[PDB]
């Protein structure tokens, strides 16, 4: 029993995952051009008060990521952060602005859902438009690394815990191939990975978009799939 994983999860309820003291991993489904997915986000402690990264992918996935987080957590979710415009980021915020979360992504980002359509986080997190930025947030810090799965694609770090969350630009290990690749910039992505790799080379978890966690492997493994697509 262990990580949760596509087929033990119905589309509608949402699993947390201890990932480290004060770090969680949440973990949905959802289907997508009729095939069903899982996708994981973050929750972190942040004082007495909880910092979300990313949605649980669809309303309902992310009203019920809320009510799992009451049950199981108890601490009040104050802010959201996306980490790139696809639904499995956004999808939900709509959900967590009229559940009082503040919510919060790159100007960047909040561009590509407008004109995408996908619902639009409210607060923009200026200081990350050049690749390698980063700025603080709550108990996380942010950083932009070039554009990868998405041109917009933010990852996010725990120092407390020497968690590395990289969102959708990182892949699991039982990857061989690059996922949705419709908006990524394959010519800039194993650029993007290194720039991950220089800046946290102490990263003692690694959590892909979808997917199993592991180690530092995930980003040169990463990297090569990337490869494999492009060829
Ligand atoms: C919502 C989002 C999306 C919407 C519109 C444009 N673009 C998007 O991405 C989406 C919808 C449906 C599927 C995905 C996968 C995905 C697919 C396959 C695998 C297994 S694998 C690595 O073995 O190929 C995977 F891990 C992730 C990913 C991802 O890659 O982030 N996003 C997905
Ligand atoms: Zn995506
Ligand atoms: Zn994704």
């Known amino acids: 029993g262990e990580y ?20 969680w991993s949440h973990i949905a489904t959802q289907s997508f051009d009729g095939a069903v997915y899982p996708s994981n986000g973050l929750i972190v402690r942040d004082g007495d008060e909880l ?7 669809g309303a309902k996935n992310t009203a019920a990521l809320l009510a799992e987080i009451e049950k199981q957590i108890g601490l009040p979710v104050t802010r959201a952060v996306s980490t790139h415009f696809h639904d499995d980021r956004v999808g ?16 960047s980002t909040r561009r590509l859902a ?36 998405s041109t917009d694609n933010l990852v996010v770090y725990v120092p407390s815990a020497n968690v590395l969350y990289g969102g959708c630009a990182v892949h699991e290990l039982s990857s061989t191939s690059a996922g949705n690749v419709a908006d990524a910039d394959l010519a800039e992505w194993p650029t993007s990975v290194e720039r991950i790799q220089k800046h946290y080379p102490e990263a003692e978890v690694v959590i892909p978009g979808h997917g199993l ?19």
């Not at 949760?4 to 770090?23: H, M």
């Not at 939900?92 to 100007?107: M, N």
């Not at 390698?132 to 799965?149: I, K, N, Q, T």
């Open 4 to 23: 949760p994983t596509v087929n033990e999860i119905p589309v509608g309820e949402v699993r947390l995952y201890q990932i480290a003291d004060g770090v």
């Open 51 to 57: 910092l979300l990264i990313d949605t649980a992918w």
């Open 92 to 107: 939900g915020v709509d959900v967590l602005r009229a559940a009082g979360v503040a919510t919060y992504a790159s100007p």
């Open 114 to 149: 407008e004109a995408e359509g996908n619902e639009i986080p409210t607060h923009s997190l200026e200081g990350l438009s050049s690749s390698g930025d980063a700025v603080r947030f709550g108990p996380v810090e942010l950083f932009y690394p070039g554009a990868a799965h």
């Open 213 to 231: 966690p592991g180690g530092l492997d995930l980003l040169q493994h990463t990297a090569n799939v990337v490869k494999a697509h492009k060829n």
